[PDB]
């Protein structure tokens, strides 16, 4: 705290409580006893524990019928209208789409759709799988996930 | 239900006359205090004056056992530095006999505003005559 280290008033003689610094935490306009510092909140996750969690999450999705598997998923042109129409045909609103190779056309079409996300097989994360109501994975995507999880 | 409590506006108080001639001072005072407080009534309530009006006659002829007639001393302080004054039982009887019974009963009554009110129902007379015939007091052989 900006300020001098001078003692505000002498130790004895005055009828005031002893003070030693104008920056004392007890005082207004200076303090914070345990002022925070920038810190890293990251936690370690064992490789096996992370893989085990993904396997459990995927197993739950198939159990709850939240995992849809299709031979392929693509759009003719990079237009949000085409992707939105396609999702309506399949009756999907909040969907996470996983593909073997993230097509540029599909990626652009889904960018403006708030409830639609497109990822590659290697981009899946535990939170995304749980967060989205439905998960759509292509046949190729299932293959890569299988090898990655082993 | 709630226990019965006497109401001061509906409590019935009777008038009695007691002859103090030859009666032991203390043993007469206890009965007077008991009746002044109303302890003899089934409707007795600690916070209500349910007692009876009592007239005491011949207060100057109250009796005391032993040598108390000349040995009992009544002390009181006037509030000044000397203050302390005393009077024997004989001196009190000669000077103001009614105070002998009044002092005895007052000590036996409860202390506080209520006890002071109960004391007001006691009428002590030195002689054998009282001017409360209008109240039709009943003879009490106490």
């Amino acid at each position: 705290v900006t300020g001098s280290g001078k003692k505000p008033w002498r130790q004895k003689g005055t009828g005031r409580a002893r003070s030693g610094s104008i920056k004392s935490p007890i005082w207004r306009s200076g303090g914070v006893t345990f002022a925070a510092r920038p810190q890293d909140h990251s936690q370690k996750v064992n490789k096996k524990m992370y893989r085990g969690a993904l396997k459990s999450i995927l197993s739950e999705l198939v159990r709850q019928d939240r995992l849809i598997v299709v031979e392929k998923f693509s759009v003719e042109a990079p237009k949000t209208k085409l992707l939105a129409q396609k999702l309506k045909d399949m009756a999907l609103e909040d969907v996470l789409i996983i593909t073997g190779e993230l097509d540029e056309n599909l990626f652009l079409a889904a960018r403006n759709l708030h409830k639609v996300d497109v990822r590659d097989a290697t981009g899946i994360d535990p939170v995304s799988l749980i967060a989205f109501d439905k998960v759509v994975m292509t046949a190729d995507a299932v293959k890569q996930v299988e090898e990655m999880l082993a | 239900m709630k226990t019965f409590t006497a109401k001061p506006e509906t409590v019935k108080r009777d008038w009695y006359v007691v002859d103090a001639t030859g009666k032991t001072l203390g043993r007469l005072a206890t009965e007077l205090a008991r009746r002044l407080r109303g302890k003899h009534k089934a409707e007795y309530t600690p916070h209500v004056d349910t007692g009876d009006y009592i007239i005491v006659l011949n207060a100057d002829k109250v009796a005391v056992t032993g040598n108390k007639r000349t040995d009992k001393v009544y002390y009181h302080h006037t509030g000044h530095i000397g203050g302390i004054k005393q009077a024997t039982f004989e001196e009190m009887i000669a000077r103001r006999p009614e105070r002998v019974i009044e002092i005895a009963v007052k000590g036996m009554l409860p202390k506080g505003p209520l006890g002071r009110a109960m004391f007001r129902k006691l009428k002590v007379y030195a002689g054998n005559e009282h001017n409360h015939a209008a109240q039709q007091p009943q003879v009490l052989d106490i």
């Binding site: 999450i57 739950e60 999705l61 709850q64 939170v127 749980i130 967060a131 | -």
Partner: protein
């Protein structure tokens, strides 16, 4: 399986002591340090 339906295993998330926060907590007014002495002071205690 939703972000608001996951719970930790029982007995794996103990709360943690909070000293000097009232009589009810059982750790107020010297928070387990006892009374006057070197050990009760801030930074007090003897070396290894």
């Amino acid at each position: 399986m939703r972000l608001n339906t996951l719970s930790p295993a029982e007995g794996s998330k103990k709360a943690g002591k909070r000293l000097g926060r009232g009589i009810g907590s059982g750790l107020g007014k010297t928070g387990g340090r006892g009374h006057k002495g070197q050990k009760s002071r801030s930074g007090g205690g003897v070396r290894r």
